[PDB]
Design a binder for this molecule. Structure first.
Ligand code: CLA
Ligand code: CLA
Ligand code: CLA
Ligand code: CLA
Ligand code: CLA
Ligand code: CLA
Ligand code: CLA
Ligand code: CLA
Ligand code: LMG
Ligand code: BCR
Ligand code: SF4
Ligand code: SF4
Lengths: 79, 218, 73, 131, 663, 86, 119
C-alpha cells in the first residue's frame, strides 16, 4: 500500500490484512440463499404495493373476511 | 356562419390565394405533423406584413390563405392583420382527415365584442378568495382542485368551518357496536323509512345517556 | 335614497385578498344600480403591483373609516 | 322581482346560519366529529362556560376542594423536604459513592413536588366549579 | 393525445407522494400504503446493516484490528474494478495481495464495544439480520392481507341502521390510532429497548471487556463519569446504568395515554384541548414534520456527543473516524431539520382547516395573525447577525493585512466562558467527592476564544436565516400579499407569470429550495468550525478571527495531500479522494446552469435539435417525435435538478477533503 | 389543459380577452357590473398558460385566474410545433 | 489466501452493475410504452378508472366522493332550511330553496377532468 496523508506516514499507521480467507464459500452461499429469499419476497411486496388494495375482492374472492376480536375493540375504544 | 372548404395544405400546392411570402424553415414541420391551422382573410391593398414563422409576406388584393402548425401563430397573424384594419379574417383548424373546424371568430363576432347567446363558461360567483380551502375537500371530488368546487359545495364547507369551531356544543359520533351488529348483509329488516325512525330513537337514547353521565360531576 | 358611503368619504377596506386590506381610500363613486355586486369605487394613494390605485368593492367591504392622518395608511 | 346581489347575499347568510347550527347536531356525521377529533368525549366534557369542568382532573373529579388543597400543601411540604434533604442538607452522594444506598424515603418524597403542583392546580379547578 | 419527455420528471417528482396517487380514494388506502412502505424501508435498513456486517466479516480484517486497534486501520471492503492496472500494484494493495478500502464509518469500534470478538459472531449476526429483513417483508404482506380481509369482512357487515357508514372512518384505526401508538412506542420501543440493551451490556459487553467477574452482579451499574483511561471511552458499566435509568423512566412514562382500555390513561385529544395546542393530529404531514423535528435534536446531539464523550473503544484514537462521524450526523440532522419545516409548510397547504377570518383559536391561527411580525423580527435578527459578524471579520482581515494584529476587535466569549465555568465547577465538585477520582471528560468543555465567539455568531446567523426562509414559506404558503390565493395551487408550482411585478420563486416549495442553500451553508460553517478546531486547536484559537486565516491556514493549506494524490509522480491511497473531489466540483458547477439558465432558452434549443432529428435522412422515417416528444425540463423540475446537483456537489466535495486532511 | 376561471369581480375590461394569444377568452353579457358584461373562458383547451390575461386584469386581485396543471399538459397547452399529438 | 473471494466478485460486480442495470433500463423503456405506465400519477389510464370504480362498488365507499355526504336525514335538513328561508325571504321574492340549491350545485366547468375520456 502507498499511504497518503501526513498522519499515516508520520505515525506509521498500518492496515493489517488477514492471511486467511475470512468466510468460506459455503458461508457465502448460505448468506446468498437468504438474500435470494429476501429478493423474492421484496419483488412480491413491490408488486403488491404497485397494484394496491383491491376493494372489489368481496365480489369474487372466497371466504367472508375477518376482523380480529382486538381490532373490533380498537375500533370501538375510540380513535 | 358557414365554414369554408379549406383543403389540406398537402393537396393545395400552388394556389392563387397564397400571399407572396419569402418562405423559411419556420413553417409547419411536414413528415411529422398532420394537424394544420389555416387563416383566411380578404384585403384591400397588397400591404406587406410579417409571417409568424419568420420572413415577410405581401398580401393579395383579393382573398388570402395561409397554413400554420399552431393556432397561436394564426392568432398572432390575426392580431397583426386587425392592426391594419383588416376584419373578416377566419381561422380554421384542419384535422388529419381534412375536417375543417371554425375556431377564432367562433360566432362571427370577435371575442372582445359582446354577442348575445354567449354564457359565462368557467364562471365562479364570488371573489377569488371565496374558493374553499383545499384541506376541506380531501378525498372528495375536488381532492386537490379546490378552485373547481361548485358554489354549493363552497357554501357547505364554509358552514362546516363555521360549525366546527364551537367545540363545546358539538355532538360526538357514537362508537359503533362492532361485536353484536355486523350480521350477514342478507340479514336485514328492510323498512328503510323505519330505519330513520330507529336512527332518531337510538340517537335520542345516546344523547340522554350522555346528558345523564355528564350530570354526575359537572 | 343614497346607498353606501358618501362620495369623497374615507373607507377602510375589508376585502382580505385586497392589496389595500385594512387600508383606507377615498370613495370615488358608488353605483346606484341594485344589480351591481361591487358598486363602491375606491381610489388609494398607494398603488398595488399592477400600478393600479383604484378598484371597485362590494357594499359589505367598506366601513367608512376616518381620515388617515399624519404618517398613517 | 329579480334576484339582486343583495338577495343572493341574504340567501348566503341564511343558508350559512342555518347549516352551521345544523351540522353541530346529531345529524351530520363528519369524520371531524369523531371521538378524538374536535368534539369532546361523550360523558367527559372538558371545557364549559369558559371554565375547566370537573372532568378535566380525571379520577380526582370527585375530590373536594378542601381535600385537594390539603393534599397539595402536604405534598408540597413533603416533596420540598425530600429535595432539600437530598440535594443540599444531608447529601446522599458521598454515602452512595462509598458503596452505600440512597435514603429511599428521600427519593420517594422528592417526586411529590410536581405532583403537588398539579394537585394545587386541581384544587383551584375544583374550587372554581364549586365542588 | 399522449405525453412528452417531461413525463418521467413529472412522475419521479411525486413518485412517493402517495397522497397524489390516482387510485387512492380514502385514508384507508393512504395509511395502508404508508405502512407497507414503512415495512419495506425497515427491510432496506436491515439489509444495509447485514451488508456492513457481512463485508466486515468477509472482505475485512476485524480479527486483526481488534488485537491492535490504535495503530491499525480497518477495511471497508475489497476493490474489484477492471479499470485499474492489470500490471504493477495499485496504491491500495500490498503488492500481489487484493485491493482494499479503509473504513471511515466507525462500525469497527461499534462492534468491538458491543462485545464482538470473532468473525463467526459477525457472520451469525449478518444471517440474523437477513432473517429479520425476511420477517419485515412478511409482516408487510401479513398486514396488507389483514386489512384486505377487514375490507372483505365488509361483505358481511351492516349495522341494520343508516349509521353503518360510520365504519368508513374506523377501517384504518389500526394505523391512525394515536394513544395506543404513543403508549407502546414510549414504553416498549424506548424504555424496554433500553432495558434490553442494558441486559445485553451486562451479559456480553462488560463480560467481554475485562477479566472474569461475578455473575453479572449489580456492581456492574456504576456512576463514574466519562472517558475510561485505557480505552479512552465511556465506562460500559456507566452506559449500562444509563440505559437502565432511561428505560425505567420511559417505561413509567409509557403508561400515560389510554391505549388498550377505556378506563386507564388520559386521551391525547383531551391533553391538547386544555393546553396551547389542539392541533389537527390526524394530519400525516403534521406528524411527519414534528417527528422529523424530533430526530433533528437527536441526530445533532448524536454528532456532538459521539465526539465530546466518545462511547466506543479507541474511537478517539482514530483521527478520521471522529471527524467523519460528526460531519455525517450534522448533515443528517440538518436535512431532518429542513424536512420538518418543509412538511410543516405542506401541512399548512394540504391538511389544515382554518376558521373564517377572526376566530383566534387554533395555534396556527394565532401564528398567522401576526406572521408579519415574526418574519420582520427574524429578518431583523438575521440582518444584525450578518452585518456585525461580516463587519468584524472584515475589520480583523483588514487590520491583520495591514501588519496590525493588535488592532483587531476580539470580543472575549464571556457568556460561553461563564457557562463552561459553571459546568466545570459542577463537574469538579462531582469528581472531588469521589474515592476513585482523576477522571476525564475529553472535549465536553473546550477552550473558548474570540474566534469561537465569531464562528458561533456566524452559525447563529445561518440558523436564523434558514429558519427565516422556511418559516416565511410555511406562513405564506396559504397566501401572501403578492399572491393571495396560494393555497388554491399546489405546494410546488412554477410561478404566477411575469405580470404583477414578476413572480419567480413564489411557491412554498420555492421557499424550501431557497432555504436548502442556507441549510447547506450553515452546515458547511459548522463542519468547517469543527474540522478546523480538530486539525489544530492552537492555530484556530489564535488565527481564526480574520477570514483570511480560514481561507489560507485551513482550506489552501490542508488541501495539499489531496491534490498530490494522483499526479505525474505516482499515486497514493488518496487517488479516489482526489478523483471524487474533482467529480463533485464538476457536479456542483453543473447544477449552476439548471439554476441560472431557465427554461425558455432551452426549450428553443430543444426545438432546434428536434428540427434536426426530424430533418435527418434516416431518423425521420423511424421517429417523428409524436410518442415521447422531447421537451425542456419544466421550471420546478429545473430548480429541483439544479438544487440536487448543488447539494450533491457541496456535500460530497467535503469527505475527500476530510480524509485527505485527517488521514 | 390548464384551468382558467372567471370570478364575479370582473368589470368587463375586455383587456384579458385582447391579451390572450390563442383566443381562449370571450365577452359574454351579464348584469353584475356597470359594463353589463363579464369575461368567459369557453376554450381553455387552447390555453397555453402565458398568464397575459392575469397581467392585463386591473381588479384588486385578478378576476381571471389561470391554474397551471403540469401533469395535465396537452399538445395545445404545450404549444407543440415540431410534433403532432393527433 | 486473503483473495479467493474475488471469484464471487468477478461474477457479481459485472452482473449487478452492468447486466442488471442494462436489463432494468430496457425493461423500463418497454414499460414506458404500456397503457398501464405510471397509472398512479399519469392521468387518464385504464387501471385508474377500474380502481376508482372498484372503490365505488364497495358498499362503504359508494357515496364517499360527495362533499355533502353525511346528512343522516337530508329531507329534514332541506325542510328546516326551507322553513328558515321562508321567514327571511325578502318581500315578494320568487326564489325557492329547492331550485336555488339546484342552480347553486350546477356550475359550468366543461374542462374539468376531461382526461376521463381516453382510457
Ligand atoms: C461545469 C458545469 C457545466 C457543464 C458541464 C455544462 C455543460 C454544457 N453546457 Mg452549460 N452552463 C453552466 C455550467 C455547465 N454547463 C453554467 C454555470 C451556465 C450559466 C447559465 C451554463 C450555461 C449554458 C448555456 C447558456 C449553454 C450551455 C451549453 C452547454 C452544453 C455544451 C457543451 C457540451 O455539449 O459539452 C458536452 C457536455 C459535457 C459535460 C462535456 C463532458 C461530457 C463528459 C465528460 C463525457 C461523457 C461522460 C460519460 C458518457 C459518462 C456517462 C454517464 C454515466 C452515468 C455513465 C453542455 C451540456 C450550451 C448547449 O447546450 O449548447 C449545445 C448552451 O447553449 N450552458
Ligand atoms: C406530569 C404530568 C401529569 C399530569 C398533570 C397528569 C394528570 C392526570 N392523570 Mg396522569 N400520568 C402521568 C403524568 C401526568 N398525569 C404519567 C407520567 C403517567 C404514566 C405513569 C400517567 C398515567 C396516568 C394514568 C394511567 C391515568 C392518569 C390519570 C390522570 C388524571 C387523574 C389524576 C389522578 O388521579 O392522578 C393521581 C389527571 C388529569 C387518570 C385519568 O383520569 O385517566 C382517565 C388515569 O387513569 N395518568
Ligand atoms: C471510467 C471510470 C470508472 C468506472 C466506470 C469505474 C467502475 C467501477 N468502480 Mg471505480 N474508480 C475509478 C474509475 C472508474 N471506476 C477511478 C478513477 C478511481 C480512483 C483511482 C476508482 C476507484 C474505485 C474504488 C475505490 C472502488 C471502485 C469501484 C468500482 C465498481 C463499483 C460499481 C458499483 O457498485 O456501482 C454502484 C454505483 C452507484 C451506487 C452509483 C449510482 C449513481 C465499478 C466496476 C468499487 C468496487 O470495486 O466495487 C466492487 C470500489 O470500491 N472504483
Ligand atoms: C461504487 C459503489 C460502492 C458501493 C455500493 C459501496 C458499498 C459500501 N461501502 Mg464503499 N466506497 C466506494 C464505493 C462503493 N462502496 C468508493 C469508490 C470509495 C472510496 C471513496 C468507498 C469508500 C468507503 C468507506 C470509507 C466506507 C465504505 C463503506 C461501505 C459500506 C456501507 C455503505 C457506504 O458507506 O457507502 C459509501 C459510499 C461511498 C463512499 C462512495 C459511493 C458514493 C455514491 C456513488 C454517491 C451517493 C449515492 C446515493 C446516495 C445513492 C458498503 C459495503 C463503509 C463501511 O463500513 O463498509 C463496511 C465505510 O466505512 N466505502
Ligand atoms: C441515512 C441515515 C443514517 C445513516 C446511514 C447513519 C449511519 C451511521 N450511524 Mg446513525 N443516526 C441517524 C441516521 C443515520 N446514521 C439518525 C437519524 C439518528 C438519530 C436517531 C442516528 C443515531 C445514531 C447513533 C446514536 C449512533 C449512530 C451510529 C452510526 C454509525 C454506525 C451505525 C451502524 O452501522 O451500526 C450497526 C454510522 C456511521 C453509531 C456510531 O456512531 O457508530 C460509530 C451510534 O452510536 N447513529
Ligand atoms: C427613516 C428610515 C428608516 C427607519 C426609521 C427604519 C426603521 C426600521 N427598519 Mg428599516 N429600512 C430603511 C429605512 C428605515 N428603517 C431603508 C431605507 C431600507 C432599505 C435598505 C430599510 C430596510 C430594512 C430591512 C430589510 C429591515 C428593516 C427593519 C427595520 C426596523 C428595525 C430596525 C432596523 O432593522 O434598522 C436597521 C435598518 C437597516 C438595516 C436599513 C438601513 C438604514 C437606512 C439606510 C437608513 C435611512 C434613513 C434615511 C436616509 C433618513 C433620511 C432623513 C432625511 C431625509 C431627513 C425598524 C422599524 C427590520 C424589521 O422590520 O425588523 C422589525 C428589517 O428586517 N429595515
Ligand atoms: C456570499 C454570498 C451571500 C451573501 C453575503 C448573502 C447575504 C444575505 N442573504 Mg443570501 N443567498 C445567497 C448568498 C449570499 N447571501 C445564495 C447563494 C442564496 C441562494 C438563493 C441566498 C438566499 C437567501 C435567502 C433566501 C435569504 C438570504 C438572506 C440574506 C441576508 C441575510 C441577512 C444578513 O446577513 O444581512 C447582512 C448583509 C450582508 C452581510 C451583506 C453585506 C452588506 C455590506 C457589504 C456590509 C443577506 C443580505 C435572507 C434575508 O433577506 O435576510 C433579511 C433571506 O431571506 N439569502
Ligand atoms: C441579534 C443579536 C444577537 C444574537 C442572536 C447573539 C447570539 C449569540 N451570542 Mg451574542 N452578542 C450580541 C448580540 C447577539 N448575540 C451583542 C450586541 C453583544 C455585545 C457586543 C454580544 C456579546 C456576546 C458575548 C460576549 C457572547 C455572545 C454569545 C452568543 C451565543 C450564545 C448565546 C448568548 O449567550 O448570547 C447572549 C444573548 C444576547 C447577546 C442577546 C442580546 C440581544 C440584544 C438585542 C442585542 C443588542 C444589545 C445592545 C447592543 C445592548 C446595548 C447596551 C447599551 C444601552 C449600554 C449566540 C450565538 C456567546 C458565545 O458565542 O460564546 C461562545 C458569548 O460568550 N454574545
Ligand atoms: C447527496 C444527495 C442529497 C441531494 C438530494 C437533495 C434533494 C432534496 C430532496 C427534495 C426532494 C423532495 C422534492 C421533490 O421531490 O419535489 C421536487 C419536484 C416536485 O415536482 C413538482 O411537483 C409539483 C406538485 O407538488 C408540480 O406537479 C410540479 O409540476 C412538479 O414539478 O420534483 C421534480 O421536479 C423532480 C424532477 C427531477 C426528477 C429526477 C428523477 C430522479 C431520478 C434519479 C433518482
Ligand atoms: C438455489 C441455491 C443456490 C443459489 C442461490 C442464488 C442464485 C442466490 C442469489 C441471490 C441473489 C441474487 C440475491 C439478491 C438479493 C437482493 C436483495 C435482497 C435486494 C433486496 C431489496 C430490497 C429488500 C428492497 C426492496 C424495495 C425496493 C428498493 C423497491 C420498493 C419496495 C422495496 C422496499 C421492497 C446455491 C447453489 C448458492 C445454494 C443452494 C440454493
Ligand atoms: S381583464 Fe379582468 S376585469 Fe377586465 S374583463 Fe378581463 S377578467 Fe374582467
Ligand atoms: S393564460 Fe394566456 S392563453 Fe391562457 S387564457 Fe390567459 S392569456 Fe389566454
Amino acid at each position: 500500500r502507498v499511504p497518503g496523508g501526513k498522519r499515516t506516514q508520520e505515525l506509521g499507521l498500518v492496515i493489517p490484512m488477514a492471511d486467511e480467507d475470512g468466510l468460506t464459500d459455503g458461508q457465502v452461499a448460505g448468506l446468498f440463499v437468504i438474500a435470494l429469499v429476501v429478493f423474492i419476497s421484496a419483488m412480491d411486496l413491490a408488486k403488491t404495493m404497485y397494484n394496491g388494495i383491491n376493494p372489489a375482492k368481496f365480489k369474487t374472492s372466497k371466504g367472508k373476511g375477518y376482523i380480529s376480536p382486538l381490532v373490533k375493540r380498537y375500533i370501538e375504544n375510540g380513535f | 356562419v358557414v365554414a369554408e372548404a379549406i383543403p389540406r395544405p398537402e393537396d393545395l400546392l400552388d394556389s392563387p390565394k397564397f400571399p407572396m411570402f419569402e418562405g423559411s424553415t419556420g413553417g409547419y414541420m411536414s413528415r411529422s405533423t398532420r394537424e394544420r391551422h389555416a387563416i383566411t382573410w380578404t384585403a384591400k391593398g397588397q400591404a406587406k406584413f410579417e409571417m409568424p414563422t419568420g420572413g415577410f409576406a405581401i398580401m393579395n388584393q383579393g382573398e388570402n390563405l395561409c397554413y400554420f402548425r399552431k393556432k397561436e401563430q394564426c392568432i398572432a397573424l390575426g392580431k397583426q392583420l386587425r392592426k391594419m384594419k383588416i376584419e373578416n379574417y377566419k381561422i380554421y383548424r384542419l384535422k388529419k382527415d381534412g375536417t375543417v373546424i371554425f375556431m377564432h371568430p367562433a360566432d362571427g363576432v370577435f371575442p372582445e365584442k359582446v354577442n348575445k347567446g354567449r354564457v359565462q363558461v368557467n364562471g365562479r360567483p364570488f371573489t377569488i378568495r371565496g374558493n374553499p380551502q383545499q384541506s376541506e375537500l380531501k378525498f372528495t371530488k375536488y381532492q386537490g382542485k379546490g378552485y373547481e368546487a361548485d358554489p354549493l359545495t363552497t357554501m357547505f364547507v364554509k358552514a362546516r368551518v363555521m360549525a366546527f369551531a364551537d367545540v363545546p356544543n358539538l355532538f360526538a359520533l357514537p362508537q359503533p357496536n362492532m361485536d353484536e351488529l355486523v350480521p350477514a348483509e342478507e340479514v336485514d329488516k328492510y323498512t328503510r323509512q323505519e330505519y330513520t325512525t330507529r336512527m332518531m330513537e337510538a340517537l335520542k337514547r345516546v344523547q340522554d345517556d350522555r346528558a345523564a353521565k355528564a350530570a354526575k360531576s359537572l | 335614497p343614497w346607498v353606501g358611503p358618501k362620495k369623497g368619504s374615507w373607507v377602510k377596506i375589508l376585502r382580505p385578498e385586497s392589496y389595500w386590506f385594512q387600508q383606507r381610500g377615498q370613495v370615488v363613486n358608488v353605483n346606484q344600480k341594485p344589480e351591481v355586486k361591487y358598486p363602491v369605487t375606491v381610489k388609494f394613494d398607494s398603488v398595488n403591483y399592477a400600478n393600479v390605485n383604484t378598484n371597485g368593492y362590494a357594499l359589505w367591504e367598506v366601513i367608512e373609516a376616518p381620515a388617515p392622518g399624519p404618517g398613517e395608511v | 322581482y329579480t334576484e339582486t346581489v343583495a338577495d343572493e347575499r341574504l340567501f348566503e347568510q341564511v343558508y350559512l346560519q342555518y347549516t352551521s347550527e345544523y351540522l353541530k347536531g346529531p345529524l351530520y356525521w363528519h369524520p371531524d366529529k369523531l371521538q378524538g377529533w374536535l368534539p369532546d368525549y361523550p360523558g367527559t366534557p372538558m371545557i364549559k362556560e369558559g371554565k375547566y369542568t370537573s372532568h378535566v382532573i380525571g379520577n380526582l373529579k370527585a375530590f373536594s376542594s378542601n381535600e385537594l388543597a390539603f393534599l397539595s400543601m402536604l405534598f408540597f411540604g413533603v416533596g420540598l423536604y425530600g429535595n432539600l434533604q437530598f440535594n443540599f442538607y444531608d447529601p446522599q452522594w458521598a454515602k452512595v459513592d462509598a458503596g452505600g444506598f440512597f435514603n429511599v424515603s428521600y427519593i420517594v418524597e422528592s417526586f411529590l413536588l410536581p405532583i403537588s403542583f398539579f394537585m394545587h392546580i386541581a384544587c383551584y379547578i375544583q374550587r372554581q366549579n364549586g365542588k | 393525445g399522449r405525453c412528452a419527455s417531461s413525463r418521467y420528471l413529472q412522475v419521479l417528482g411525486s413518485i412517493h407522494d402517495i397522497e397524489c396517487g390516482f387510485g387512492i380514494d380514502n385514508t384507508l388506502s393512504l395509511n395502508l400504503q404508508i405502512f407497507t412502505a414503512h415495512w419495506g424501508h425497515l427491510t432496506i435498513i436491515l439489509i444495509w446493516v447485514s451488508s456492513n456486517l457481512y463485508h466486515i466479516a468477509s472482505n475485512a480484517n476485524y480479527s486483526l484490528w481488534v488485537k491492535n486497534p490504535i495503530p491499525s486501520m480497518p477495511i471497508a471492503h475489497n476493490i474489484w474494478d477492471p479499470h485499474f492496472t492489470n500490471s504493477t500494484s495499485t496504491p491500495y494493495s500490498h503488492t500481489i495481495i487484493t485491493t482494499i478500502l479503509i473504513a471511515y464509518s466507525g462500525i469497527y469500534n461499534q462492534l468491538y464495544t458491543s462485545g464482538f470478538n470473532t468473525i463467526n459472531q459477525i457472520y451469525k449476526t449478518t444471517f440474523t439480520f437477513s432473517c429479520l429483513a425476511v420477517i419485515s417483508i412478511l409482516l408487510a404482506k401479513i398486514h396488507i392481507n389483514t386489512h384486505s380481509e377487514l375490507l372483505h369482512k365488509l361483505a358481511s357487515h351492516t349495522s341494520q341502521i343508516p349509521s353503518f357508514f360510520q365504519l368508513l372512518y374506523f377501517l384504518d384505526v389500526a394505523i391512525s390510532s394515536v394513544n395506543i401508538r404513543f403508549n407502546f412506542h414510549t414504553g416498549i420501543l424506548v424504555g424496554l429497548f433500553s432495558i434490553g440493551y442494558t441486559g445485553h451490556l451486562l451479559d456480553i459487553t462488560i463480560p467481554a471487556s475485562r477479566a472474569p467477574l461475578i455473575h453479572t452482579s449489580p456492581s456492574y451499574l456504576t456512576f463514574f463519569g466519562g472517558l475510561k483511561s485505557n480505552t479512552s471511552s465511556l465506562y460500559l458499566t456507566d452506559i449500562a446504568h444509563h440505559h437502565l435509568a432511561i428505560g425505567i423512566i420511559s417505561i413509567l412514562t409509557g403508561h400515560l395515554y389510554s391505549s388498550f382500555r377505556a378506563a386507564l390513561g388520559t386521551y391525547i385529544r383531551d391533553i391538547l384541548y386544555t393546553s396551547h395546542l389542539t392541533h389537527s393530529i390526524k394530519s400525516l404531514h403534521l406528524a411527519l414534520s414534528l417527528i422529523l423535528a424530533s430526530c433533528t435534536p437527536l441526530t445533532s446531539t448524536t454528532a456532538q456527543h459521539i465526539y465530546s464523550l466518545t462511547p466506543y473503544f479507541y474511537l478517539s484514537y482514530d483521527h478520521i473516524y471522529s471527524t467523519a462521524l460528526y460531519v455525517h450526523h450534522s448533515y443528517i440532522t440538518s436535512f431532518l431539520a429542513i424536512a420538518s419545516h418543509a412538511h410543516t409548510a405542506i401541512t399548512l397547504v394540504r391538511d389544515w382547516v382554518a376558521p373564517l377570518e377572526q376566530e383566534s383559536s387554533s395555534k396556527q391561527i394565532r401564528i398567522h395573525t401576526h406572521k408579519a411580525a415574526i418574519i420582520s423580527h427574524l429578518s431583523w435578527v438575521s440582518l444584525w447577525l450578518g452585518f456585525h459578524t461580516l463587519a468584524v471579520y472584515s475589520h480583523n482581515d483588514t487590520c491583520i493585512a495591514f501588519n496590525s494584529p493588535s488592532k483587531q476587535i476580539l470580543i472575549e466569549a464571556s457568556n460561553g466562558q461563564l457557562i463552561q465555568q459553571a459546568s466545570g465547577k459542577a463537574l469538579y465538585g462531582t469528581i472531588n467527592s469521589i474515592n476513585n477520582y482523576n477522571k476525564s471528560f475529553d472535549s465536553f468543555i473546550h477552550p473558548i476564544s474570540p474566534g469561537d465567539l465569531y464562528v458561533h455568531h456566524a452559525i447563529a446567523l445561518g440558523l436564523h436565516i434558514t429558519v427565516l426562509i422556511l418559516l416565511k414559506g410555511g406562513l405564506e404558503a396559504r397566501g401572501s400579499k403578492l399572491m393571495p390565493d396560494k393555497m388554491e395551487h399546489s405546494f410546488g408550482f412554477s410561478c404566477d407569470g411575469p405580470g404583477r411585478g414578476g413572480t419567480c420563486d413564489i411557491s412554498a416549495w420555492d421557499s424550501f429550495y431557497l432555504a436548502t442553500f442556507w441549510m447547506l451553508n450553515s452546515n458547511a460553517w459548522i463542519s468547517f468550525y469543527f474540522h478546523y478546531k480538530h486539525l489544530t486547536p492552537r492555530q484556530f484559537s489564535e488565527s481564526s478571527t480574520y477570514l483570511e486565516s480560514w481561507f489560507r491556514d485551513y482550506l489552501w493549506f490542508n488541501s495539499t495531500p489531496l491534490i498530490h494524490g494522483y499526479s505525474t509522480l505516482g499515486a497514493n491511497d488518496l487517488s479516489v479522494q482526489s478523483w471524487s473531489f474533482l467529480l463533485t466540483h464538476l457536479a456542483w458547477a453543473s447544477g449552476f446552469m439548471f439554476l441560472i439558465s431557465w427554461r425558455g432558452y432551452w426549450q428553443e434549443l430543444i426545438d432546434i435539435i428536434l428540427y434536426i432529428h426530424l430533418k435527418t435522412p434516416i431518423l425521420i422515417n423511424l421517429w417523428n417525435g409524436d410518442i415521447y416528444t422531447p421537451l425542456a425540463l419544466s421550471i420546478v423540475q429545473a430548480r429541483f435538478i439544479g438544487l440536487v446537483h448543488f447539494s450533491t456537489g457541496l456535500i460530497l466535495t467535503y469527505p475527500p477533503f476530510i480524509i485527505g486532511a485527517t488521514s | 389543459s390548464h384551468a382558467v376561471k372567471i370570478y364575479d369581480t370582473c368589470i368587463g375590461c375586455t383587456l384579458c380577452v385582447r391579451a390572450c394569444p390563442t383566443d381562449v377568452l370571450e365577452m359574454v353579457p351579464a348584469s353584475i357590473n356597470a359594463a353589463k358584461q363579464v369575461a368567459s373562458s369557453p376554450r381553455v383547451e387552447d390555453c397555453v398558460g402565458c398568464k397575459r390575461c392575469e397581467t392585463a386584469c386591473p381588479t384588486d386581485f385578478l378576476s381571471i385566474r389561470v391554474y397551471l396543471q403540469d401533469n395535465e399538459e396537452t399538445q395545445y397547452s404545450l404549444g407543440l410545433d415540431l410534433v403532432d399529438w393527433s | 489466501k486473503y483473495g479467493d473471494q474475488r471469484k464471487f466478485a468477478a461474477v457479481l460486480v459485472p452482473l449487478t452493475t452492468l447486466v442488471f442495470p442494462a436489463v432494468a433500463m430496457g425493461m423500463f423503456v418497454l414499460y414506458s410504452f404500456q397503457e398501464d405506465a405510471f397509472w398512479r400519477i399519469v392521468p387518464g389510464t385504464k387501471r385508474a378508472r377500474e380502481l376508482d370504480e372498484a372503490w365505488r362498488e364497495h358498499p362503504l365507499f359508494a357515496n364517499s366522493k360527495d362533499p355533502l355526504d353525511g346528512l343522516i336525514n337530508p329531507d329534514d335538513y332541506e325542510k328546516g332550511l326551507e322553513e328558515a328561508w321562508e321567514r327571511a325571504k325578502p318581500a315578494g321574492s320568487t326564489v325557492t330553496v329547492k331550485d336555488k340549491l339546484k342552480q347553486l350545485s350546477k356550475q359550468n366547468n366543461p374542462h374539468w377532468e376531461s382526461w376521463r375520456a381516453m382510457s
